[PDB]
Design a binder for this molecule. Structure first.
Ligand SMILES: Nc1ncnc2c1ncn2C1O[C@H](COP(=O)(O)CP(=O)(O)O)[C@@H](O)[C@H]1O
Ligand SMILES: Nc1ncnc2c1ncn2C1O[C@H](COP(=O)(O)CP(=O)(O)O)[C@@H](O)[C@H]1O
Ligand SMILES: [Mn+2]
Ligand SMILES: [Mn+2]
Lengths: 187, 187
């Protein structure tokens, strides 16, 4: 395939809308910053989750601590470590890559890197703590629907059961977004 | 919270962009049709997956058979049964709800219902067949990143391991989108 022409329709606060012609076909893309989420597992197999209101659905959803990659030039896991601290007041000595997910491949370039933080330390000075098995059962019961949350909860669940393994921080993040950030539409 | 004012910025082919003022805060929302995906598991624990090019990432991704809810008034599982047939040429006698996922809760109202189709029959007249365990290991290895795919693969993996259970077709789909379809911006 090949992009014959790109046309920017709208630039917003956190994303930009663009319309391209391909291969001929029309493809409207939503350029996003990209984001990072954290699955902080403690010594007893529990992870913290936040209950946040999502205007898109008009209700609160259970999710993993997460943030947008809106900090130009800042390393993803640095962003992730900051959000973990600010969201649930936790510092972690060990960071690994749990799972990368492309949220809506159909119309957006957003990709989210989910980290697995361990060696937890309570620092600083709404949310709840869930045993991984429960968080997982909550997913399968529809109580956790946020795609990022589902991916992280079930991934660490595969790890906690010995089925799979975490990964190094230098693991390549293939689809990390760059378009919107490259615009640098701020001043 | 409360929407003080909604402003439609752009209506596209498969989604519409809208900007609302809330509670005051600005929230730009991408109205989507919603979609359905299928995890068709055969008598031996294998599921079919398609390899499709995603312009948003400029490469091909491994995904579950899926379709947009662009068929006005058509029941979701009917849409799902049609896509399963057209995508991998399979008919299924048993349909259950596996998992619902809200793709990018941060800026879109898109929600996807993932079904678990069993009692498979090859009908009709690129894709591949994967043992659930492998598909799962592929997710944890980053070879499967599509959020819908990750959610479906790992969910059916929790079911195949006896950890969780599928669900009835009448299971409420809380976040099923309605905004864009309610516009009926076609003729
Ligand atoms: N980002 C986009 N912008 C404009 N049209 C899109 C689009 N993404 C998909 N479409 C389209 O919507 C219709 C069906 O698309 P797909 O069957 O590729 C969706 P799916 O497998 O990605 O869920 C096609 O006719 C095509 O116009
Ligand atoms: N859909 C949207 N439209 C306009 N601004 C948005 C937005 N979604 C989030 N923002 C915002 O981006 C900044 C941080 O947002 P959040 O920390 O709520 C993101 P996250 O937990 O949803 O990943 C806020 O200053 C706010 O403007
Ligand atoms: Mn956040
Ligand atoms: Mn499709």
């Amino acid at each position: 395939f090949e992009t014959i022409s790109s046309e920017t329709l709208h630039t917003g606060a956190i994303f930009a809308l663009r319309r391209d012609q391909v291969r001929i076909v029309t493809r409207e893309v939503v350029e996003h910053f990209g984001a990072v989420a954290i699955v902080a597992m403690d010594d007893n197999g529990n992870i913290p989750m936040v209950y946040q209101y999502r205007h898109t659905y008009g209700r609160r959803l259970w999710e993993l601590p997460a943030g947008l990659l809106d900090v130009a030039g800042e390393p993803p896991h640095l962003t992730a470590a900051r959000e973990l601290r600010e969201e649930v007041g936790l510092q972690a000595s060990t960071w690994q890559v749990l799972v990368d997910l492309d949220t809506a491949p159909g119309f957006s370039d957003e990709s989210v890197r989910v980290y697995l933080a361990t060696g937890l330390r309570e620092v600083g000075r709404t949310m709840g703590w869930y045993p991984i098995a429960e968080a997982a059962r909550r997913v399968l019961r529809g109580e956790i629907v946020n795609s990022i949350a589902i991916a992280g909860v079930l991934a660490v669940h595969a790890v906690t059961t010995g089925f799979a393994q975490p990964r190094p921080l230098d693991t390549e993040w293939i689809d990390r977004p760059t378009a919107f950030a490259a615009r640098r539409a701020e001043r």
